mmCIF file of C-alpha atoms in Angstrom:
data_model
loop_
_atom_site.group_PDB
_atom_site.id
_atom_site.type_symbol
_atom_site.label_atom_id
_atom_site.label_comp_id
_atom_site.label_asym_id
_atom_site.label_seq_id
_atom_site.Cartn_x
_atom_site.Cartn_y
_atom_site.Cartn_z
ATOM 1 C CA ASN T 1 0.000 0.000 0.000
ATOM 2 C CA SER T 2 1.092 3.590 0.695
ATOM 3 C CA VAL T 3 2.507 3.093 4.206
ATOM 4 C CA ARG T 4 5.143 0.754 5.620
ATOM 5 C CA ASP T 5 7.111 -0.025 8.784
ATOM 6 C CA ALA T 6 10.825 0.361 8.145
ATOM 7 C CA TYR T 7 14.051 2.227 8.846
ATOM 8 C CA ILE T 8 13.407 5.770 7.599
ATOM 9 C CA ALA T 9 16.319 6.949 5.355
ATOM 10 C CA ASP T 10 17.647 10.192 3.901
ATOM 11 C CA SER T 11 18.142 10.949 0.177
ATOM 12 C CA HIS T 12 21.441 9.073 0.256
ATOM 13 C CA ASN T 13 19.895 5.723 1.375
ATOM 14 C CA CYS T 14 21.338 6.124 4.883
ATOM 15 C CA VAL T 15 19.514 5.256 8.065
ATOM 16 C CA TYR T 16 19.263 7.838 10.841
ATOM 17 C CA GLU T 17 21.280 6.691 13.819
ATOM 18 C CA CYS T 18 19.791 7.376 17.212
ATOM 19 C CA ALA T 19 20.585 7.715 20.891
ATOM 20 C CA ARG T 20 16.990 8.243 22.071
ATOM 21 C CA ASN T 21 13.624 6.726 21.289
ATOM 22 C CA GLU T 22 12.038 10.164 21.368
ATOM 23 C CA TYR T 23 14.415 11.412 18.648
ATOM 24 C CA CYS T 24 12.961 8.733 16.394
ATOM 25 C CA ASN T 25 9.312 9.231 17.267
ATOM 26 C CA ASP T 26 9.722 12.915 16.413
ATOM 27 C CA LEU T 27 11.585 12.283 13.156
ATOM 28 C CA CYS T 28 9.114 9.617 12.101
ATOM 29 C CA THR T 29 5.921 11.457 13.012
ATOM 30 C CA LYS T 30 6.895 14.800 11.505
ATOM 31 C CA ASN T 31 7.289 12.806 8.305
ATOM 32 C CA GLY T 32 3.814 11.311 8.437
ATOM 33 C CA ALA T 33 4.333 8.084 10.380
ATOM 34 C CA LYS T 34 2.120 6.996 13.273
ATOM 35 C CA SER T 35 5.106 6.667 15.618
ATOM 36 C CA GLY T 36 8.726 5.567 15.776
ATOM 37 C CA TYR T 37 11.490 4.347 18.043
ATOM 38 C CA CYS T 38 15.215 3.742 18.132
ATOM 39 C CA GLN T 39 16.450 0.318 17.045
ATOM 40 C CA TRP T 40 19.861 -0.489 18.597
ATOM 41 C CA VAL T 41 19.808 -3.878 16.896
ATOM 42 C CA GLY T 42 18.076 -4.960 13.697
ATOM 43 C CA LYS T 43 18.474 -5.595 9.969
ATOM 44 C CA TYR T 44 20.743 -2.552 9.564
ATOM 45 C CA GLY T 45 21.743 -2.127 13.198
ATOM 46 C CA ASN T 46 21.367 1.185 14.975
ATOM 47 C CA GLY T 47 18.790 3.440 13.395
ATOM 48 C CA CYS T 48 15.328 4.933 13.648
ATOM 49 C CA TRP T 49 12.405 2.599 12.851
ATOM 50 C CA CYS T 50 9.030 4.129 11.866
ATOM 51 C CA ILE T 51 5.505 2.789 12.005
ATOM 52 C CA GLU T 52 3.280 3.450 8.961
ATOM 53 C CA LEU T 53 5.694 5.834 7.172
ATOM 54 C CA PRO T 54 4.090 7.202 3.930
ATOM 55 C CA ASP T 55 5.764 6.063 0.709
ATOM 56 C CA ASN T 56 6.786 9.524 -0.497
ATOM 57 C CA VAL T 57 9.434 9.428 2.296
ATOM 58 C CA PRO T 58 12.500 7.167 1.790
ATOM 59 C CA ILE T 59 13.224 3.980 3.732
ATOM 60 C CA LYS T 60 16.524 2.117 3.819
ATOM 61 C CA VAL T 61 16.658 -0.269 0.853
ATOM 62 C CA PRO T 62 19.354 -2.835 -0.036
ATOM 63 C CA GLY T 63 22.538 -1.078 -1.043
ATOM 64 C CA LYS T 64 25.049 1.383 0.334
ATOM 65 C CA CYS T 65 24.686 4.642 2.196
ATOM 66 C CA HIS T 66 26.059 7.034 -0.461
#
């Protein structure tokens, strides 16, 4: 569909590292997501994970952070 749970990414395919869960909830929600938190372990390791992020915003996809 038009929303998905995933690591939000910038225009360079790079995840957003995090030190706080609140940093991620803010980043995710200002970008349209329902909520978000900091993942200190996961598919791409440390980074913000968002819940229901709209598909006009990038998510980390296979490949390098360039």
